[PDB]
Amino acid sequence: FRSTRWQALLNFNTQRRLLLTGTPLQNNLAELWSLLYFLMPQTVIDGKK
DNA sequence: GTACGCGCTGTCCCCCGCGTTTTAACCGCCAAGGGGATTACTCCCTAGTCTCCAGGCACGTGTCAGATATATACATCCTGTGCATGTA
């Protein structure tokens, strides 16, 4: 979440994005929530609800 | 008068540039603690101010020091002044 590259690529002008990854981490919901927010900026920060 | 500033010369030589090697620094982790100037508050105590009585460095006066003009007892030529022996 706090990485500079995370905010670096958010402003890029694209209308469709695709993610390629083998396996994300199961627990530690923070990284999954961060990936979800990066995919589209609509979800709320509160993932503990 | 003269010799050093100036102009010219060759001699070579050390940094420039372009390339190649090596490395300092920021990003991620993983969020953790850690301390020092700041703001507010609470006492607290020593200089400002007044105060008069003592007194002391700027000031004027005396006297030795340093330097200078003045007779003074010789000092060095200068002026008369006298003597002895050979000459026509």
mmCIF file of C-alpha atoms (C1' of nucleotides) in Angstrom:
data_model
loop_
_atom_site.group_PDB
_atom_site.id
_atom_site.type_symbol
_atom_site.label_atom_id
_atom_site.label_comp_id
_atom_site.label_asym_id
_atom_site.label_seq_id
_atom_site.Cartn_x
_atom_site.Cartn_y
_atom_site.Cartn_z
ATOM 1 C CA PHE A 1 0.000 0.000 0.000
ATOM 2 C CA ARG A 2 2.709 2.490 1.028
ATOM 3 C CA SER A 3 5.045 1.665 -1.875
ATOM 4 C CA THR A 4 5.914 4.534 -4.201
ATOM 5 C CA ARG A 5 5.233 2.382 -7.268
ATOM 6 C CA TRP A 6 1.693 1.797 -5.981
ATOM 7 C CA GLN A 7 0.821 5.479 -6.382
ATOM 8 C CA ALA A 8 3.129 5.839 -9.395
ATOM 9 C CA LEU A 9 1.011 3.713 -11.751
ATOM 10 C CA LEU A 10 -2.441 4.717 -10.471
ATOM 11 C CA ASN A 11 -2.542 7.974 -12.460
ATOM 12 C CA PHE A 12 -1.774 6.271 -15.787
ATOM 13 C CA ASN A 13 -4.353 6.819 -18.531
ATOM 14 C CA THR A 14 -5.869 3.393 -19.207
ATOM 15 C CA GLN A 15 -9.422 2.095 -19.521
ATOM 16 C CA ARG A 16 -8.683 -1.622 -19.040
ATOM 17 C CA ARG A 17 -6.076 -3.370 -16.893
ATOM 18 C CA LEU A 18 -5.049 -7.012 -16.553
ATOM 19 C CA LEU A 19 -3.145 -8.601 -13.669
ATOM 20 C CA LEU A 20 -0.819 -11.586 -14.108
ATOM 21 C CA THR A 21 0.241 -13.372 -10.924
ATOM 22 C CA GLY A 22 0.716 -16.936 -9.772
ATOM 23 C CA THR A 23 -0.735 -16.981 -6.244
ATOM 24 C CA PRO A 24 -1.514 -14.085 -3.887
ATOM 25 C CA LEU A 25 -1.290 -14.524 -0.134
ATOM 26 C CA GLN A 26 -4.308 -16.162 1.495
ATOM 27 C CA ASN A 27 -4.255 -14.506 4.926
ATOM 28 C CA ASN A 28 -3.219 -10.891 5.655
ATOM 29 C CA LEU A 29 -6.251 -9.368 3.939
ATOM 30 C CA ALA A 30 -4.422 -6.031 3.662
ATOM 31 C CA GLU A 31 -2.549 -6.929 0.466
ATOM 32 C CA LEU A 32 -5.656 -8.373 -1.199
ATOM 33 C CA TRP A 33 -7.591 -5.225 -0.289
ATOM 34 C CA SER A 34 -4.786 -3.064 -1.692
ATOM 35 C CA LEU A 35 -4.820 -5.032 -4.951
ATOM 36 C CA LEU A 36 -8.605 -4.670 -5.138
ATOM 37 C CA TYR A 37 -8.366 -0.904 -4.601
ATOM 38 C CA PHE A 38 -5.654 -0.665 -7.252
ATOM 39 C CA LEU A 39 -7.810 -2.583 -9.746
ATOM 40 C CA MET A 40 -10.578 0.009 -9.388
ATOM 41 C CA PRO A 41 -10.809 3.037 -7.041
ATOM 42 C CA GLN A 42 -14.319 2.476 -5.695
ATOM 43 C CA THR A 43 -14.026 0.036 -2.792
ATOM 44 C CA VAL A 44 -13.899 1.355 0.766
ATOM 45 C CA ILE A 45 -10.771 1.025 2.894
ATOM 46 C CA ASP A 46 -12.624 -0.856 5.662
ATOM 47 C CA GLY A 47 -12.060 -4.515 4.841
ATOM 48 C CA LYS A 48 -12.452 -5.674 8.436
ATOM 49 C CA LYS A 49 -16.250 -5.362 8.262
ATOM 50 C "C1'" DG B 1 74.193 52.890 -19.435
ATOM 51 C "C1'" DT B 2 72.454 48.733 -19.526
ATOM 52 C "C1'" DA B 3 69.555 44.859 -18.784
ATOM 53 C "C1'" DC B 4 65.225 43.131 -18.395
ATOM 54 C "C1'" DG B 5 60.634 43.086 -20.796
ATOM 55 C "C1'" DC B 6 59.252 41.267 -24.988
ATOM 56 C "C1'" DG B 7 58.987 38.560 -29.014
ATOM 57 C "C1'" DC B 8 60.325 34.427 -31.177
ATOM 58 C "C1'" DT B 9 61.829 29.595 -31.175
ATOM 59 C "C1'" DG B 10 61.558 24.544 -30.423
ATOM 60 C "C1'" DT B 11 60.632 20.830 -26.787
ATOM 61 C "C1'" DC B 12 57.741 17.874 -24.629
ATOM 62 C "C1'" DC B 13 54.134 16.831 -21.596
ATOM 63 C "C1'" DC B 14 50.073 16.542 -18.794
ATOM 64 C "C1'" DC B 15 45.099 17.050 -18.984
ATOM 65 C "C1'" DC B 16 40.800 16.176 -22.476
ATOM 66 C "C1'" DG B 17 37.777 13.147 -24.192
ATOM 67 C "C1'" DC B 18 35.798 9.160 -25.034
ATOM 68 C "C1'" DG B 19 35.384 4.718 -23.438
ATOM 69 C "C1'" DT B 20 35.187 1.028 -19.837
ATOM 70 C "C1'" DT B 21 34.742 -0.571 -14.549
ATOM 71 C "C1'" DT B 22 33.237 0.061 -10.163
ATOM 72 C "C1'" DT B 23 30.256 1.748 -6.822
ATOM 73 C "C1'" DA B 24 26.783 5.062 -3.837
ATOM 74 C "C1'" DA B 25 22.096 5.653 -3.148
ATOM 75 C "C1'" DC B 26 17.036 5.004 -3.200
ATOM 76 C "C1'" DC B 27 13.290 1.603 -3.011
ATOM 77 C "C1'" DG B 28 10.556 -2.463 0.272
ATOM 78 C "C1'" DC B 29 10.428 -4.761 4.660
ATOM 79 C "C1'" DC B 30 8.309 -4.008 9.048
ATOM 80 C "C1'" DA B 31 6.452 -0.787 11.559
ATOM 81 C "C1'" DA B 32 8.507 -0.011 16.158
ATOM 82 C "C1'" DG B 33 10.365 3.232 19.676
ATOM 83 C "C1'" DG B 34 12.614 7.991 21.393
ATOM 84 C "C1'" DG B 35 13.820 12.529 22.688
ATOM 85 C "C1'" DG B 36 14.112 17.728 22.589
ATOM 86 C "C1'" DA B 37 12.280 22.499 21.650
ATOM 87 C "C1'" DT B 38 7.581 24.485 22.910
ATOM 88 C "C1'" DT B 39 3.727 26.312 25.713
ATOM 89 C "C1'" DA B 40 1.823 26.950 29.742
ATOM 90 C "C1'" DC B 41 2.141 27.609 34.671
ATOM 91 C "C1'" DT B 42 4.156 28.785 39.258
ATOM 92 C "C1'" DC B 43 6.796 31.245 42.372
ATOM 93 C "C1'" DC B 44 10.990 34.622 43.717
ATOM 94 C "C1'" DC B 45 14.525 37.811 44.005
ATOM 95 C "C1'" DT B 46 17.869 41.398 42.474
ATOM 96 C "C1'" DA B 47 18.390 45.773 39.882
ATOM 97 C "C1'" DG B 48 15.917 50.365 39.306
ATOM 98 C "C1'" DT B 49 15.109 54.372 41.849
ATOM 99 C "C1'" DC B 50 15.736 57.433 45.433
ATOM 100 C "C1'" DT B 51 19.092 58.917 48.981
ATOM 101 C "C1'" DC B 52 23.111 61.553 51.113
ATOM 102 C "C1'" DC B 53 28.057 61.240 52.594
ATOM 103 C "C1'" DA B 54 32.685 60.336 51.229
ATOM 104 C "C1'" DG B 55 36.355 61.018 47.920
ATOM 105 C "C1'" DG B 56 39.606 61.330 43.864
ATOM 106 C "C1'" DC B 57 41.667 61.773 39.076
ATOM 107 C "C1'" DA B 58 41.979 66.225 36.373
ATOM 108 C "C1'" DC B 59 44.469 70.111 37.454
ATOM 109 C "C1'" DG B 60 48.154 73.311 38.864
ATOM 110 C "C1'" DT B 61 52.705 73.725 40.892
ATOM 111 C "C1'" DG B 62 58.255 72.325 41.976
ATOM 112 C "C1'" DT B 63 62.181 70.495 40.622
ATOM 113 C "C1'" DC B 64 65.661 67.388 38.133
ATOM 114 C "C1'" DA B 65 67.138 66.284 33.081
ATOM 115 C "C1'" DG B 66 68.735 67.302 28.622
ATOM 116 C "C1'" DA B 67 70.638 70.493 25.816
ATOM 117 C "C1'" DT B 68 73.092 75.084 24.940
ATOM 118 C "C1'" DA B 69 75.827 79.561 25.167
ATOM 119 C "C1'" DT B 70 80.091 81.441 27.590
ATOM 120 C "C1'" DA B 71 84.678 82.596 29.562
ATOM 121 C "C1'" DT B 72 89.268 80.074 29.782
ATOM 122 C "C1'" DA B 73 93.791 78.058 29.916
ATOM 123 C "C1'" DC B 74 96.625 76.609 26.784
ATOM 124 C "C1'" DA B 75 97.875 75.900 21.244
ATOM 125 C "C1'" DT B 76 99.855 76.877 16.666
ATOM 126 C "C1'" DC B 77 101.794 80.040 13.470
ATOM 127 C "C1'" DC B 78 103.403 84.918 13.102
ATOM 128 C "C1'" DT B 79 106.370 88.900 14.292
ATOM 129 C "C1'" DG B 80 109.973 91.146 15.711
ATOM 130 C "C1'" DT B 81 114.814 90.730 17.299
ATOM 131 C "C1'" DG B 82 119.468 89.642 18.556
ATOM 132 C "C1'" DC B 83 123.965 86.930 17.651
ATOM 133 C "C1'" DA B 84 128.400 84.997 15.295
ATOM 134 C "C1'" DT B 85 131.678 84.498 11.744
ATOM 135 C "C1'" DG B 86 133.464 85.001 6.598
ATOM 136 C "C1'" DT B 87 133.834 88.359 2.935
ATOM 137 C "C1'" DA B 88 136.553 92.483 -0.701
#
